[PDB]
Design a binder for this molecule. Sequence first.
Ligand SMILES: N[C@@H](CCC(=O)N[C@@H](CS)C(=O)NCC(=O)O)C(=O)O
Ligand SMILES: N[C@@H](CCC(=O)N[C@@H](CS)C(=O)NCC(=O)O)C(=O)O
Lengths: 209, 209
Amino acid sequence: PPYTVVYFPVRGRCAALRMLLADQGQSWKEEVVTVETWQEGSLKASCLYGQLPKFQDGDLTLYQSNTILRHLGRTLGLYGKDQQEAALVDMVNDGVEDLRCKYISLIYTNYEAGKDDYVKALPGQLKPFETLLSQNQGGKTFIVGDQISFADYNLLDLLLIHEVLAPGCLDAFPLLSAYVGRLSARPKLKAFLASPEYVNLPINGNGKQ
Amino acid sequence: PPYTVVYFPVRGRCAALRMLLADQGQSWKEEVVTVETWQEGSLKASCLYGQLPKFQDGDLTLYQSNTILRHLGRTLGLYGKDQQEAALVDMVNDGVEDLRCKYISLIYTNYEAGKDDYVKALPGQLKPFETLLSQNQGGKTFIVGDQISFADYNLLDLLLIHEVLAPGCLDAFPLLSAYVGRLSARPKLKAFLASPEYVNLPINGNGKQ
Ligand SMILES: N[C@@H](CCC(=O)N[C@@H](CS)C(=O)NCC(=O)O)C(=O)O
Ligand SMILES: N[C@@H](CCC(=O)N[C@@H](CS)C(=O)NCC(=O)O)C(=O)O
């Protein structure tokens, strides 16, 4: 176990990277931080931007969930076959991040009064991803190219958490639906998604989803 | 190359990539999109995520400002000397992006009532960058390593727009102050920042800054 993930006991911004590690057959150590430990102050005080996750790869300490993903994509060969693909992978990931931010604000700042709006606008937000798939070998493979990239794990998590928020939201999108099923069927990932370490963790830190 | 930048006639999310292109001796064509043109709908409907900027590098069309920056970073040698530096460059850029997002929400949604609170919390938001500089050879050169990266351009823009929003905000940060002074003095960058094509564009589209 050369990697260490320091985070709160929630899926949140660490779910995609955990899926990547699990699917890639990589070993890691989870350093769980409880709300109490956080409230004490010291740890937050040591974090670059005062937030988690924190990640250790040997002697290298990183912060920022997308920085961690790009790092693993870079060192594990999950960043496209060439520079042209690397750019498309980034483009996809940034799009995922944008929607993730909107999702986070809903959950933490206006879940009750904003849900219906969010849900009605959701299909307009998902359409771009359906488009990218239709444009890459008829959506029969990955989001970019013929190989899995760190953007697939991030997109998959986004899709999964949206199905929980708005059941059947992928029904109008044939390629996204098939994509989720296909990736979810990968043996190592399938086992992980069914394990207690994933299943018994809440999606968000406030219990809403 | 060559490159085509498609954006509204404002600095905004295109300022950093323009500074990079100018300073690194690149040439690009600016395709200005007027609000009247945007509101008509044809171009927007064509944009992957329904938003600008759009960037062309031959037949490679990209969207997402940070994707454009990383693309230029890896093709122009502005992404660190190795994998560890690349990770650090990403960490800095994601931090800049987080703060830029807060700045944009302030500008577009709560300028009048939220400015004071924002400014009061600004020192805490800038401290991590002052810290990063101190950890890199006492902050005598660049944000990461001893050669310029795309993160330097993005960070420079963030600091420039904050000095306009809150005059004197960098006075408390000696390393960040000196850093902005060094970078602004770079010949090509200096000339660009003094030119009409930069100076005569508003920072943000809604006329607030
Ligand atoms: N851009 C950062 C954001 C990290 C973040 O928002 N962390 C939250 C949890 S999702 C946190 O640490 N909150 C604790 C605090 O702000 O005190 C990333 O993507 O890693
Ligand atoms: N994550 C995108 C955000 C782009 C963005 O916010 N674009 C705005 C202008 S700054 C836009 O195109 N607004 C027009 C619209 O949404 O209709 C990026 O970083 O490029």
